[PDB]
Amino acid sequence: HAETRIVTDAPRNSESVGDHLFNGGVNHHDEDPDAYTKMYGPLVGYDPRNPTTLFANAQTGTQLVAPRKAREILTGIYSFEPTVLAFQREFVKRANAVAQPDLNSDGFSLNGLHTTFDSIRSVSGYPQWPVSALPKSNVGLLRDLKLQERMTARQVVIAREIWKRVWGHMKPTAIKIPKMSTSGPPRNVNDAEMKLQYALALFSGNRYNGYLDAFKSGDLSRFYRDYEAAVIMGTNVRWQVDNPGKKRDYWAQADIERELAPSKRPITTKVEINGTVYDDFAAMRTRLVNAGPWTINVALQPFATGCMNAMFELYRATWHPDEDKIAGFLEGKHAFFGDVSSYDHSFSEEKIDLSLEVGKEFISPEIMELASSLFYAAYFTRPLGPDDGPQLVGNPNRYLEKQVKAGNRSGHAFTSLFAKVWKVIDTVSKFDQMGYDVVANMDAILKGDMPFGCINNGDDEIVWFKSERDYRLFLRLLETQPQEQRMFKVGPEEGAVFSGSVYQLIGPLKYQAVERITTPFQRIICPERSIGGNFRKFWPLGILERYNKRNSHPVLEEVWRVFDDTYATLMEPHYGSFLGIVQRAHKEIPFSVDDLSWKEIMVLDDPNKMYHRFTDEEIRDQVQESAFRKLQPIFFERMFKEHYKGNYV
Ligand SMILES: [Mg+2]
């Protein structure tokens, strides 16, 4: 067949997906063009006069995006209970007494500890409100961050060279289809079987071409009707423990319609649990995250993952070094651990557009414009504070025009790729400001065969130098960088942390990796999510892994001593033994703490690390399958043959 539509004229819900499960071998949708149409139901229908109904069958209307609701931190222990709060008080005070952060002027910890334990007096499930909204424009943020208005000529050349190498190489890799997250509109279900069947549809017959024709027409009704697609972001919230004494502000929902780049209001949330003020406790910090619909992202992800997998291979020293060897690598080398403020939101419009423009050299233009549509899409959010209502920001009916300019948009197939590449572009520009010819020597820099380079994990980076004069001029360059050179607001990172571990300065140019000592106790005592449920099915593993290496560092060992003793006195009599709780749940999960590598345990705690930190080769199938369905490259080879002109790696 040669059908161009995913949704044909066939009668809907006339077949059952249970009768056409995918066997890894043949794409049934090749044999039957009406199959996707028949196995799923009629859509509600898109009325351009009220686009929010895209999200109607999903959490609805008025429920807050971040409700105040106590977490189950451990089996039978809930975060709003006084006993817990009293425990947190005593633990933090005891842990502070046993260890204080010993930092030098460069920002390195000499003892391993980089901060106090005060943040563990945070009440999980009790959010700072309002959750800060996304303004229609970010130019006020660029101006507040005193960043460049545009890139310099040389920076545009450097960016073109690096993106040429990234878009120009692809290592075809399975599309990862997430099991536990929403498809977003129009179906708004957490159904990886549907997401997979949709993918088989898009990549069978002439559906991808048909999808793009509909996309580029600008006829939202047609694109929705025939491909169950609409260019619009839904909204989520991520929770984390806040840092004492940082400026806590937010963009109000009421302000974002009044001007494009409104100023920020102060968060004033206090912790009061049924009329009892906890003046020494913090509410959880909340951050708005967008999430793109599967039916938009599925068309972009092959390129995203293909380009990134090739990038990890061709330029491993920059983008995918053996994490366990980093400390040994930096030995005898000077190191700058960068810290970036509002990285992703601070991406200029020019930078997003340049990325997609260079991509058109290697990928069909309609695919890059689709990507451009999602980066700049309208979004719908449920209330962000208790006084707000639901809100559509932007006009999705005009999706071919830019609606929201929010930099490297969260929820986009390209988000991690963009994070990774632009941080290197920034840093390599600095190498060029130092008087080296980065264009001539670009591959050697990226492969790590020059006297200096950078080790990247998105906004987190290590810039390394064999020479002390290079290192010093680099620091000088940052202290004296004029605004027109300033791509991102970068400063040195207190504690010198990279990918979760403090790089302890144990001797002259000798570093030692230790996981941030606060992390274990934050993740237990102040979790983003309750144990179990959707995202925390494997929760005993992360705890037991950490507990089993408690003796591996002197400060870690003493803090764990204070956790155990304090838990034993203040918690155990009410809730039972800590290890009792952790081991009983341990025995319920399919993997032992000893069955798994540290990398596999991280993926089980955050599956999205499969999209940016680990490859298929490092994580066993049984672990990946816990969170993902997959569609192997052969099933979208045809699409690539037509739409990709780069090199296969
Ligand atoms: Mg860092």
Asked if 48 and 367 touch (Cβ cutoff 8 Å), the reply is no
The CA 338 to ligand 1 mean position distance, Å, reads 6
Asked if 192 and 178 touch (Cβ cutoff 8 Å), the reply is yes
| Distance from C-alpha of 552 to C-alpha of 295, rounded to nearest angstrom | 46
DSSP string, 194-235: HHHHHHHHHTSTTHHHHHHHHHHH--HHHHHHHH-----BEE
| Distance from C-alpha of 198 to C-alpha of 191, rounded to nearest angstrom | 11
Which stretch of DSSP H or E encloses residue 164? helix 153-167
| Distance from C-alpha of 428 to C-alpha of 426, rounded to nearest angstrom | 6
Q: Write out the binding residues for Mg(2+).
A: 19, 259, 338, 459-460, 493, 497, 616, 619
How many structural domains are present in the chain? 1
The CA 563 to ligand 1 mean position distance, Å, reads 27
The CA 195 to ligand 1 mean position distance, Å, reads 35
The CA 376 to ligand 1 mean position distance, Å, reads 28
The CA 499 to ligand 1 mean position distance, Å, reads 7
φ, ψ of residue 409 in degrees (nearest 5) = -55, 125
Q: Write out the binding residues.
A: 19, 259, 338, 459-460, 493, 497, 616, 619
| Distance from C-alpha of 99 to C-alpha of 96, rounded to nearest angstrom | 5
237: left (phi over 0), alpha (psi -120 to 50) or beta: beta
For 62, other C-beta atoms within 10 Å of its C-beta total: 10
The CA 538 to ligand 1 mean position distance, Å, reads 27
The CA 496 to ligand 1 mean position distance, Å, reads 6
- Where b means 16+ CB within 10 Å and e means fewer, 403-412 reads bbbbbbbbbb
Asked if 516 and 114 touch (Cβ cutoff 8 Å), the reply is yes
Domain carrying residue 616: 1-649
CA angle 453, 459, 460 (to 5 degrees): 60
Residues whose CB is less than 8 angstroms from the CB of residue 547 and which lie 6 or more positions away in sequence, other chains included: 520, 560, 582
φ, ψ of residue 338 in degrees (nearest 5) = -80, 150
Residue type, 531: I
| Distance from C-alpha of 221 to C-alpha of 600, rounded to nearest angstrom | 43
The CA 517 to ligand 1 mean position distance, Å, reads 15
Dihedral angle computed from the Cα positions of residues 369, 370, 372 and 373, in that order, rounded to the nearest 10 degrees? 120
Which stretch of DSSP H or E encloses residue 558? helix 554-570
The CA 567 to ligand 1 mean position distance, Å, reads 31
The CA 340 to ligand 1 mean position distance, Å, reads 8
How far are the Cα atoms of 80, 529, 575 from residue 83, in angstroms, in the given order? 9, 20, 10
φ, ψ of residue 254 in degrees (nearest 5) = -65, -30
Q: Establish how many alpha carbons lie within 13 A of residue 598's alpha carbon, considering only the half-sphere containing its beta carbon.
A: 10
φ, ψ of residue 648 in degrees (nearest 5) = -90, 125
The method of structure determination was X-ray
| Distance from C-alpha of 215 to C-alpha of 231, rounded to nearest angstrom | 9
Tokens at 278, concatenated: 């906890």
The CA 500 to ligand 1 mean position distance, Å, reads 8
H-assigned helices in 32-152: 35-39, 82-98, 139-144
| Distance from C-alpha of 335 to C-alpha of 464, rounded to nearest angstrom | 5
How far are the Cα atoms of 452, 468, 530, 638, 639 from residue 449, in angstroms, in the given order? 8, 17, 46, 37, 36
φ, ψ of residue 293 in degrees (nearest 5) = -65, 140
